[PDB]
Design a protein around this nucleic acid. Structure first.
Length: 854
DNA sequence: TAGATATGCATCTCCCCCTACTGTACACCACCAAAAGT
DNA sequence: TTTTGGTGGTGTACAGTAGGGGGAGATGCATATCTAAC
């Protein structure tokens, strides 16, 4: 009865368990005496030495569940899976010798668990001391070379060749540890010596280039295909040195390069696919699998899902063969069944994970929506990061657990799942969460905000480990720490702070506050160290105090900025005459290095006050570049002058604003009457792209249904937050009038942050008509300042105290909530005592803050 | 040799961490001119 | 003179995009002796 398509003393289908066979160690019996899954034991009798490995396991496992054996379980299954009966024997033999002292079980399992099992093992107990002695290495690195198949060839050709490499090629030791700590270990070490110089003096390869071309599995194979194939491309494909080079610094480097020579031209010649891009799809784990797959799937994806070649490529880049493929398989099943768009889908498929998430999304989409109350969006946003499957999975297995073990909201948990690390971070969460509230004085939010950012696990950890300490003689009020552990270079920052806090005050008399504001950016370490060098250089020889260094140094990426000054600072005054104080300014917004450089390049109709300006925001680079691109094209619509476009661009969403004035200047002037002036007003603001667009898609509805005029809608849209302003105005207009008035709403909304102002009214609307009584209008009158959603909130929080505790009148408070709002409000409440208390004064002139009066 | 027995090497897929660049929204403040009380 | 408004500059978050690394596990074939049925 043939589960269909020299068995065996039962034909294969014996103890009906699964069909999950062979199973070819042609060797079989359960014989079970259980103690894990079927998937494991099967996964072990699948190997040379299967049975004998299952039985030996029995002698170490029974020799486990009585006395202190040093080990976990599936751990033991791992020793038997990859180590074989062989390694398993070398362990319940050598265990006490390792327990001395060797290593942790962490690192024993780690080196017994391969093919050189027993040898790798036996060897390490022979050469670990001689490695930490005569060469000073670590229980860490050594067991990191034995840890892969070949540890015996690995360690040995490490003791023979470590010298030749530095006695004639001088590669730092940590660099040979990076050449050996791999599968071809030996074959890397070997092919370095044989081929290290025969290129540099015939090709020009930075010695660190090939150290990192050999720091993978396939070393021998990468340089032999670099040296061999290098010209064909650099000839009639002409890639730079470092391009071919970096296509080669990965596992299975050879076939990346070989499929380039093979497929590079034939791709772009009849697939408009830049060389530069092909090179990108090559340069990744398994790239060949990409190029190969790509030639077959580019046109079918573009012609069945109408995908753009840049998306298919973007997916090819880091989702790989499995990701494109998985998107062929499931584009329809998804985009056209569970509410998805071929863009949210590509979004999911354009990360290493790839296949792995798309699938885990398919399955658990409703499971997490239907049940644990999420939306397709929030799920397709926990899915779009390298650790997709992982993060989604754990969200499912920890959401109500986190919601009940303490009380962490839902939206809040989605925020922790949605970056790389969702698992490790939600798992360092459940670990350390309480260990920091009753026992370490950090709140819930104060910590989810450590999870929620890029930092994750490594950053929550360095916090318990280093938050008590740091405040011993470094000071740093927690506020200061929780901020530091909240960026990407998290763990890196906190450490580097323990490091150079003193070398900064003990050298630059640079305050604390001054520094916690450097350890507080996505790229902490990169800056602390880079100011240590580049501080003395500047203030001394150029012109900056400490401030101007720290100011330049405090954005995600401090490093690049400083460096691009020391290099390019002078030149901008020695050729470009930008008053240095204007140059420490085109360089202290996040894209620093990049804006500096693009002034150097591009500066050469316009001025310096005017150019320092356009480049001074995050736009920086794409700011100017687009300016040149469009300044011409723009002064030719009914639009602009030179002044105008400049003002459009002196703001963060620059390039976005411009290309949205361009793509939409004459589109709604045929739907309304916008002089180009009005348009420029909507876009000479942060978030143009969103304010022009929304103005276009939402203009019809208001004017036609709600009657809102043009001017009204333009007063709305031309403040900062147009999109929010509008999309919140329309949403909530009807609801207010039915006793608010049309213009009262429009007014409250016609201020920056109108969206928020409108809301806090809709919300705290009754509380004031109902309690310490106030009329809709005095209220509207508070809510229409920029004070807004803030002066209102505080005004309820303080009606009690100022009228009762202090002695005030509802019409004086409104007249502050409506003049100086929030701060002026509290500050009054909290300054009245003083003046009356030192040497004679009265609460008569202290309200509102009457001019003078002395 | 055939093929166990035991170990070495290459390649491919996935999951994790750090750093740099870009873009949107809010809240305050302060300075200077129109617009009004008086 | 007071009362508003308008503009620009500053500080700060919050939100999105982009690629630099490494490292673990699986599978499949590649060797090196030794053992074993032929």
């Amino acid at each position: 009865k043939p589960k269909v398509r020299e068995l065996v003393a039962h034909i294969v289908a014996l103890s009906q368990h699964p069909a999950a066979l062979g199973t070819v160690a042609v060797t079989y019996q359960h014989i079970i005496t259980a103690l894990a899954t079927h998937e494991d034991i099967v996964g072990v009798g699948k190997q040379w030495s299967g049975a004998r490995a299952l039985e030996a396991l029995l002698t170490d496992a029974g020799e486990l569940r009585g006395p202190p054996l040093q080990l976990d379980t599936g751990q033991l299954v791992k020793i038997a899976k990859r180590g074989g009966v062989t390694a398993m024997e070398a362990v319940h033999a050598s265990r006490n010798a390792l327990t001395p002292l060797n290593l942790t079980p962490a690192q024993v399992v780690a080196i017994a668990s391969n093919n050189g099992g027993k040898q790798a093992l036996e060897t390490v107990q022979r050469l670990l001391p001689v490695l930490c002695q005569a060469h000073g290495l670590t229980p860490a690195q050594v067991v990191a070379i034995a840890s892969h198949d070949g540890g015996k060839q690995a360690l040995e050709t490490m003791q023979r060749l470590l010298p030749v490499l530095c006695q004639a090629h001088g590669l730092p030791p940590d660099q040979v540890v990076a050449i050996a700590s791999n599968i071809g270990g030996k074959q890397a070490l070997e092919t370095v010596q044989r081929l290290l110089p025969v290129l540099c003096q015939a090709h020009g390869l930075t010695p660190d280039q090939v150290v990192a071309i050999a720091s993978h599995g396939g070393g021998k194979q990468a340089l032999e295909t670099v040296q061999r194939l290098l010209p064909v491309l650099c000839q009639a494909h002409g890639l730079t040195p470092d391009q071919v080079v970096a296509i080669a610094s990965h596992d299975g480097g050879k076939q990346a390069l070989e499929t380039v020579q093979r497929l590079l031209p034939v791709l772009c010649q009849a697939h408009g696919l830049t060389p530069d891009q092909v090179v990108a799809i090559a340069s990744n784990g398994g790239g060949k699998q990409a190029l190969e797959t790509v030639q077959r799937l580019l046109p079918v994806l573009c012609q069945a899902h109408g995908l753009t070649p840049d998306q298919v490529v973007a997916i090819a880049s880091n989702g790989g063969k499995q990701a494109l493929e998985t998107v062929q398989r499931l584009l329809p099943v998804l985009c056209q069944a569970h509410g998805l768009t071929p863009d949210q889908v590509v979004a999911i498929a354009s990360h290493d994970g790839g296949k792995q998430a798309l699938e885990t999304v398919q399955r658990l989409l409703p499971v997490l929506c239907q049940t644990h109350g999420l939306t397709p969006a929030q799920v397709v946003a926990i899915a779009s990061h390298d650790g997709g499957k992982q993060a989604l999975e754990t969200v499912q297995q920890l959401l109500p657990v986190l919601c009940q073990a303490h009380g962490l909201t839902p939206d809040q948990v989605v925020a922790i799942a949605s970056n790389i690390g969702g698992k490790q971070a939600l798992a360092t969460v459940q670990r350390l969460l309480p260990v920091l509230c009753q026992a370490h004085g950090l709140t819930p939010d104060q910590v989810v905000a450590i999870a929620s950012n890029g930092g994750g696990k490594q950053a929550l950890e360095t916090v318990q480990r280093l938050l008590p300490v740091l405040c011993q003689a470094h000071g740093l009020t927690p506020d200061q720490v929780v901020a530091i552990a909240s960026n990407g270079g998290g763990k890196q920052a906190l450490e580097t702070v323990q490091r150079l806090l003193p070398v900064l005050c003990q050298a630059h008399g640079l305050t604390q506050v001054q520094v916690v504001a450097i350890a507080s950016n996505i790229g902490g370490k990169q800056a602390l160290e880079t100011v240590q060098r580049l501080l003395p250089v500047l203030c001394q020889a150029h012109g900056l105090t400490p401030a101007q260094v720290v100011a330049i140094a405090s954005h995600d990426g401090g490093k690049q900025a400083l460096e691009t000054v020391q290099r390019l600072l002078p030149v901008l005054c020695q050729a470009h005459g930008l008053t240095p104080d204007q140059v420490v300014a085109i360089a202290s917004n996040g894209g620093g290095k990049q804006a500096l450089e693009t002034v150097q390049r591009l500066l050469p109709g316009l001025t310096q006050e005017q150019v320092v300006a356009i480049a001074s925001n995050n736009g920086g680079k794409q700011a100017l570049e687009t300016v040149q691109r469009l300044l011409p094209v723009l002064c030719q619509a009914h639009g602009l002058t030179p002044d105008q476009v400049v003002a459009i661009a002196s703001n963060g969403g620059g390039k976005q604003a411009l290309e949205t004035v361009q793509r939409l200047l004459p589109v709604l002037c045929q739907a309304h009457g916008l002089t180009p002036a009005q348009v420029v007003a909507i876009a000479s603001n942060i978030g143009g792209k969103q304010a022009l667009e929304t103005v276009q898609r939402l203009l019809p509805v208001l004017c036609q249904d709600h009657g809102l005029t043009l001017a009204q809608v333009v007063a709305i849209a031309s403040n900062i937050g147009g999109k929010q302003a509008l999309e919140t105005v329309q949403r909530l207009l009807p609801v207010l009038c039915q006793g608010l008035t049309q213009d009262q709403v429009v007014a409250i909304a016609s201020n920056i942050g109108g969206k928020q102002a409108l809301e806090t009214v809709q919300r705290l609307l009754p509380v004031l008509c109902q309690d310490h009584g106030l009329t809709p209008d005095q209220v509207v009158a508070i809510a229409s300042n920029i004070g807004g959603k803030q002066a209102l909130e505080t005004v309820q929080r303080l009606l009690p105290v100022l009228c009762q505790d202090h002695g005030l009148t509802l019409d004086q408070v409104v007249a502050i909530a409506s003049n100086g709002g929030k701060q002026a409000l509290e500050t009054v409440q909290r300054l009245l005592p003083v003046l009356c208390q030192d040497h004679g004064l009265t609460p008569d002139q202290v309200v509102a803050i009457a001019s003078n009066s002395g």
